[PDB]
Amino acid sequence: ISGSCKGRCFELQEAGPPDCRCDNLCKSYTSCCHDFDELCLKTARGWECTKDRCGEVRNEENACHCSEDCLARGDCCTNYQVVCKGESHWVDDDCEEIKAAECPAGFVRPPLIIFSVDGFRASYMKKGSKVMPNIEKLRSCGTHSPYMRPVYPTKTFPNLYTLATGLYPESHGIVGNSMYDPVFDATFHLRGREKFNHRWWGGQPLWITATKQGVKAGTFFWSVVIPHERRILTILQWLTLPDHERPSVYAFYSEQPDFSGHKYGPFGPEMTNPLREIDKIVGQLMDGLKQLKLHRCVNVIFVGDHGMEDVTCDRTEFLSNYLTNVDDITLVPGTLGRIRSKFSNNAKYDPKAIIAALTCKKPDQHFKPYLKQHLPKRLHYANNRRIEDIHLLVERRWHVARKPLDCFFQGDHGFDNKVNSMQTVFVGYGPTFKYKTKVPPFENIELYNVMCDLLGLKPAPNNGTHGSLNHLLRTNTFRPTMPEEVTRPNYPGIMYLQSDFDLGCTCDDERHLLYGRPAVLYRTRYDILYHTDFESGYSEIFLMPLWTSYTVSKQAEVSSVPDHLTSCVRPDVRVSPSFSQNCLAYKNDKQMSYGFLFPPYLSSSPEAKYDAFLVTNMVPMYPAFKRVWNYFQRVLVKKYASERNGVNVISGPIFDYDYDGLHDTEDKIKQYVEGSSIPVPTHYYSIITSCLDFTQPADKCDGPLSVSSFILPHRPDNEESCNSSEDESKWVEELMKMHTARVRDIEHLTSLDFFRKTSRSYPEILTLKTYLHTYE
Ligand SMILES: Cc1c(Sc2cccc(C(=O)O)c2F)c2ccc(Cl)c(F)c2n1CC(=O)N1CC2(CC2)c2ccccc21
Ligand SMILES: *[C@@H]1O[C@H](CO)[C@@H](O[C@@H]2O[C@H](CO)[C@@H](O)[C@H](O)[C@H]2NC(C)=O)[C@H](O)[C@H]1NC(C)=O
Ligand SMILES: CCCCCCCCCCCCCC(=O)OC[C@@H](O)COP(=O)(O)O
Ligand SMILES: [Ca+2]
């Protein structure tokens, strides 16, 4: 009946005016029928059958029931069979492998329940069975990782919506817990109504993907005011619905342990209770499912949004100690900083000046300013109009605020997503996940694809790498295919004499490709060039290599370049003068110098060293960046070879002038070496590969591979590195670590595909390419 929730509690629709609502989200729109509390939120006698209620006469006021008709009526407390029928709690039962789903007739697929926990730090799982026994049984009997990496910013809204969509925040649009959109001229806040406007929420979240493909997602979101125990009872009742109504996916959200973590810090002794209380809810779910005989039917994901760090009031940096004018800016503060102009019509606003005022001003200053395009590419945090041009990455354990006038809290989060304290949890338990299986850490951007696979859905386009988590599942409906090469290489031979060239250059005169050539995944023209010490894929369009590959053995020697050869550049008789760089361009560019992708310092002989001076191995480099690049090539590469028992290196340029994380078409390139068609890269990458079993040398490795990579910003100064006035051994490797990257990041930024001929399974190589070497 319209106007009442009788017979309608938690109906799977949102009734519109003139009717009122009886669904799980009605409270959040202040729209519930007058009798919703009375009928749908019963609380009498709490959530647990006790021995004195067994054989009770049913009382309709009770939150849940313990009577002999309750299973037929669909309303037992989750512990009814345990207390009254001699059954065991789920947690007390032995792990038993689930070799196939055991679902009731009419279940077309295993249901999926996503149990999300706010601020659940990875290391809380160490507390184990004494504190969280149900969760520990899911973890030990199911599939788990040591941690899961959140997205940046490591806050709730960006992370939950990444879980929902498979997208980086810059793509889904929820780039913070608070944001300003200049086109809407509106502000999104944690507290308030503006966030409920769907206009903010981009991409295609799981519930929509499901509905579009005819999979029932029901009423996906709960009003958070509804107690957890009622949500669990409701999910279980929904799972008893007829085939034509019953949803196939459910979500639960707990605001704990985040709520307490803010008050008490990540390891306050007060944190124990909230973790026990979460475990009690997990136990109710699992007992409830066993009661319905669905405990070997439903896939359960237990997942956090981010971790929690020790952060106090007194550890706050104030912009007023740096800026000569704090009144003309608006700051989004806290564990990150975003700065824009306070007023719209402010011609005086100068982001570059503000950045300079914030750069390396105090020793051990606890934040670093960036223009968004200069942030580490691994953060993927730039390509959205809601991201302010000025960003502050704040040091773990610190806050930033505008003025002192701006302790009540002991924990916070939001920091760089490679910070260990920000890591969170993943457990997958059920028929589709593996049994008692540990998997390596992975990123939360990958989970949307997994949830799609679990539900038989085709994922919308997203930033996960589909196939990269196939090792979490007992059975895989998705078989990834290697992308086809788009441009086939040319293989030029000797076509010229040195005297055919007038480049203004002067000179006073497969082992190196271990995992197959990269594939070029865009339309272009390029040459494979072979040399004694290195191989390259030379672009005739960009006039430089797209990639340069070389193997350095553990015993390789580093040599210097003789004085008489420091400016040696040689024409390449395989490549037309028309598709070559020239040395006059560099001489005429007061700001630009050059470096080499294969370093002369690692030549195998003084005769082979002449290959390293080829014009086809040169790339444009600011002198400030050459400090970085020379140290990497002359010092670090050999160090890594010694540590890793040889390394294979692939290095190259990246062009991303519009900071979308994608390889630029030529029209986007904004800078060239003066008076030339030689484009200036925005970054230089390297992918460094060796044998995971370091007792085998990198070029004779029988097993899995070990990889680490970076994307270095190609900057005309070293203002980013506050200790750059010192020797490179004090600061270069620190810069490299900050700019660590996944191979997949480089693939997007270059339209290349790597690791195509390793003789390992492709899903394993996908995992390898999504690996991030964090340095913690
Ligand atoms: C508005 C919203 C919230 S905050 C929120 C949600 C529920 C209850 C409460 C509460 O105070 O009781 C609350 F504060 C939220 C949180 C996590 C995720 Cl992951 C979302 F996505 C959220 N959203 C969008 C949200 O619900 N869409 C976006 C969209 C794509 C357009 C869509 C379509 C259909 C149904 C829903 C949705
Ligand atoms: C992250 O994935 C999304 C979705 O595939 C990519 O965003 C799309 O980019 C294309 C190509 O420019 C646009 O035409 C689409 O409109 C975009 N979709 C969305 C939802 O934004 C994005 O490029 C990916 N990011 C990276 C770094 O690979
Ligand atoms: C497919 C996976 C979907 C993901 C789960 C869907 C359920 C999510 C419901 C979340 C409601 C959020 C309510 C809220 O507003 O709390 C935020 C606080 O914490 C404060 O933020 P923070 O932890 O400091 O970042
Ligand atoms: Ca680009």
Ligand SMILES: [Cl-]
């Ligand atoms: Cl934010």
Ligand code: NA
């Ligand atoms: Na120059």
Ligand code: NA
């Ligand atoms: Na510096």
Ligand SMILES: [Zn+2]
């Ligand atoms: Zn959170």
Ligand SMILES: [Zn+2]
């Ligand atoms: Zn929080």
